[PDB]
C-alpha cells in the first residue's frame, strides 16, 4: 500500500531475444516506472557478490555462468506495492509453472534461463538496488 522500489534484471537470454522493450513495457503498462536503468556485463565477482545468499544452493555455479554469459539490463522499478507487483508480472521462477501472460510464461525457455530477475522481498530490494546504484543516482 506504499510507493516502493524494487530491482529488476533483464537476463542475458531476454537480451539476445531482443525483448527488452516488450518487458519494460510490461512494467510501464502495469503501474510501475523505470526510475533507473543501465545495460552492463556482470563480472564473475559481481555475479557471485550479488547472489552471495545462494552460494551453497545447488543452482549456484550454473546461475553464475549464465548471468555472466552476456550483458543484462538492470533497472529500478517504482510504484505501489512494487516488490509484489514485479513478482506478479514476472510469474513463477520456473516458466513451466508460470501463469499465462506473465513475463516468464511469455519470454522464458527454462528455469535456468527465465528472462528476468526481481527482488523477492523488501529487504532484498534495498540491498539489490544499493548493489547496483549509488543513492545519488536515484
UniProtKB/Swiss-Prot annotation:
Its EC number is 2.7.4.6. GO terms for biological process: CTP biosynthetic process; GTP biosynthetic process; UTP biosynthetic process. It is found in: Cytoplasm. Keywords: ATP-binding, Cytoplasm, Kinase, Magnesium, Metal-binding, Nucleotide metabolism, Nucleotide-binding, Phosphoprotein, Transferase. It comes from the Bacteria. The active site is at 117 (pros-phosphohistidine intermediate). GO terms for molecular function: ATP binding; metal ion binding; nucleoside diphosphate kinase activity. The keyword Nucleotide-binding applies. ATP binds at residues 11, 59, 87, 93, 104, 114. One of its GO terms (cellular component) is cytoplasm. It is an enzyme of class 2 (transferase). Its main location: cytoplasm. It catalyses: a 2'-deoxyribonucleoside 5'-diphosphate + ATP = a 2'-deoxyribonucleoside 5'-triphosphate + ADP; a ribonucleoside 5'-diphosphate + ATP = a ribonucleoside 5'-triphosphate + ADP. Its cofactor is Mg(2+). Major role in the synthesis of nucleoside triphosphates other than ATP. The ATP gamma phosphate is transferred to the NDP beta phosphate via a ping-pong mechanism, using a phosphorylated active-site intermediate. NCBIfam families: PRK00668.1 (NF001908). Belongs to the NDK family. This is Nucleoside diphosphate kinase. It comes from Helicobacter pylori (strain G27). The gene is ndk.
